């Protein structure tokens, strides 16, 4: 069976510019993107996401964009949720489409928000970093920072929530 990881899901995101990344120790069957809280990713609504091991893009089914992985390699995810757009980086280089754009998903709904996930097949090997600690981030620096977009552990700091 396939291991599903995903964000606790109080810390969806509906608004704001997000990221993360997913270190992979195997090169492949594996996914990684963002789901709505609530089978294989991508291949209905509920989530959207990179296959680094056939180079896909996998919303409501799958297209070419990108490129494969190596073992070692760093996918970086961003969202931004107000322009509903999605992007992706391999080792800090920004992934295209067929037709040149750096949108991997864009004029999606806000819905209920949505938290990192990745999925893991047989044998792999790889693991989501939030960047609560930023400096373990491998290639935000590189690229997400100066774009506006926050680490997603800056979302998942707060444990305290106020009623009346």
């Known amino acids: 069976r396939f291991r599903i990881f995903r964000a ?4 969806a995101v509906k608004a704001g510019r997000w990221y993360f990344e997913f270190e992979m120790v195997t090169a492949g069957d594996m996914r990684v993107g963002w ?6 990713l991508g291949s209905d609504d509920r989530a959207f996401a990179f296959d680094g091991f056939k180079a896909q893009r996998w ?3 799958n297209e070419h964009y990108g490129r494969s992985w190596q073992a070692g390699d760093v996918v970086g995810c961003m969202v931004d949720m107000n322009e509903h757009t999605m992007m992706f980086t391999l ?7 067929d037709s040149g754009s750096e949108l991997a998903f864009k004029d999606f709904d806000v819905g209920d928000g949505f938290i990192p996930v990745c999925s893991l097949g047989v044998a792999q090997v790889g693991r989501m970093n939030f960047g609560k600690d930023v400096s373990t981030l491998k290639y935000f620096t590189i690229c997400g920072l100066q774009e506006g977009y926050e680490p997603f552990a800056v979302n998942t700091n707060r444990d305290i929530t106020m009623w009346l």
């Open 8 to 11: 606790e899901k109080t810390y």
């Open 35 to 40: 789901s709505r809280p609530g089978l294989e």
């Open 59 to 61: 919303h409501q089914g």
């Open 91 to 97: 080792n800090g280089e920004i992934l295209l489409d």
